[PDB]
Amino acid sequence: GLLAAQKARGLFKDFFPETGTKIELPELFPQTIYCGFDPTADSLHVGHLLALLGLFHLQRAGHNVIALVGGATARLGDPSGRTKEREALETERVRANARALRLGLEALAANHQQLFTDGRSWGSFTVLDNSAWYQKQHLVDFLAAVGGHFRMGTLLSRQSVQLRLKSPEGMSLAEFFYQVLQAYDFYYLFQRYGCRVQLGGSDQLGNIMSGYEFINKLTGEDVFGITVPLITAVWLNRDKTSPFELYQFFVRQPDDSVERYLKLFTFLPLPEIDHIMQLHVKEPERRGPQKRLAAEVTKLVHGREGLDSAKRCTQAL
């Protein structure tokens, strides 16, 4: 099964709520799944790709997926997993990054659709920007509508917010309110698109939790979250990281990690990865696993043209 396969690959790390309450994810798995991306930079990087890949897998299986650009949330800054408060970002810069992210996400989905077809009937891929609905949201109207549905006790206790909340210098009201906006986003997408699932890296669990808890509080509806593992400077935009550098980053992965990366970053069937690995024991010199990993990812973010310059450049050298 889809969930089963991704869990097996290691791409889907966990499913929530654990209780699953009324139902439980395996059961509803055309669903709509979304994942947000905050434009703190004018380019996505290799880590964000893992979350995007999670969406692609669901789309390939027939589900509709939404890649949300956080044009409004990036103005505040996600405190999840952070020790220090973020340097304030100019609104103008945030909107410029947002426009760039939207184009970046569409270019990736374009490469996906054109170079990784499998003849299956895929769901849709849509890029939205939360600033679309926040620019119409007035302060007090928002607080009067949904403010009573959030409990300070729950907000203050999220694990994701403890690093900043419990710091010696304290967290700002903006940092604290961030999770409310992400929770609202989930609720908004649930109401306008039937979105019942939100995917993100494990550092996003808290924000996702407040979202499904929020929605289950207003409606006895059940919605879920899926996290992807966090893998630990390599950008997806050619003007910051050329195809050659992106390719080299993957091609130089250690033998001990190369197999996990093939599972996480490519669409290659598990049985084929087994083959590439067994073939490797027999021919360490060819660096087959690494060459295959680099090719798949580079083709995904920079197309054939990019893959070609990438290989030709490495070969020449």
Instruction: Confirm or deny that 59 is annotated as ligand binding.
Output: no
Closest CA to 59 of 120, 15, 114: 120
Interaction between residue 103 and a second copy (CB under 8 A): no
Q: Which does 298 bind (CB under 5 to 8 A by kind): ligand YSA, a second copy, none?
A: none
Q: Between 201 and 243, whose beta carbon lies closer to ligand YSA?
A: 201
Q: Strand, helix or coil at 89?
A: coil
Instruction: Confirm or deny that 178 is annotated as ligand binding.
Output: yes
Q: Which residue has the tokens 């310059």?
A: 309
Instruction: Confirm or deny that 141 is annotated as ligand binding.
Output: no
Element (H, E) at 289: helix 288-316
Minimum distance, C-beta of residue 237 to a second copy, in the bound complex (Å): 25
Element (H, E) at 287: none
Closest CA to 16 of 204, 283, 279: 204
Q: Which does 185 bind (CB under 5 to 8 A by kind): ligand YSA, a second copy, none?
A: ligand YSA
**Binding positions for ligand YSA, rule: CB under 6 A:** 35-38, 47-48, 50-51, 68, 70, 73, 78, 130, 182, 185, 200-201, 203-204, 207, 228, 230-231
Closest CA to 70 of 133, 125, 136: 133
Calpha distance 16→316 (Å, rounded):
49
Instruction: Confirm or deny that 184 is annotated as ligand binding.
Output: no
Instruction: Confirm or deny that 134 is annotated as ligand binding.
Output: no
Minimum distance, C-beta of residue 130 to ligand YSA, in the bound complex (Å): 6
Calpha distance 55→36 (Å, rounded):
11
Interaction between residue 135 and a second copy (CB under 8 A): yes
- Report the DSSP beta bridge partners of residue 77: none
Minimum distance, C-beta of residue 203 to a second copy, in the bound complex (Å): 20
Instruction: Confirm or deny that 274 is annotated as ligand binding.
Output: no
- Assess contact for 224 and 197: CB atoms under 8 A: yes
Calpha distance 172→188 (Å, rounded):
25
- Rounded to whole angstroms, what are the CA distances from 29 to 25, 33, 224? 6, 11, 12
Interaction between residue 171 and a second copy (CB under 8 A): yes
Q: Which does 230 bind (CB under 5 to 8 A by kind): a second copy, ligand YSA, none?
A: ligand YSA
Calpha distance 18→207 (Å, rounded):
16
Minimum distance, C-beta of residue 95 to a second copy, in the bound complex (Å): 12
Q: Pattern of binders to a second copy over 33-72, x per CB under 8 A?
A: ---------------------------------------x
For a second copy, the binding residues (CB under 8 A) are 72, 75-76, 85, 88, 91, 131, 134-140, 142-144, 146-153, 155-156, 165, 170-177, 180-181
- Please state the residue numbers annotated as binding site for ATP: 38, 201-203, 231
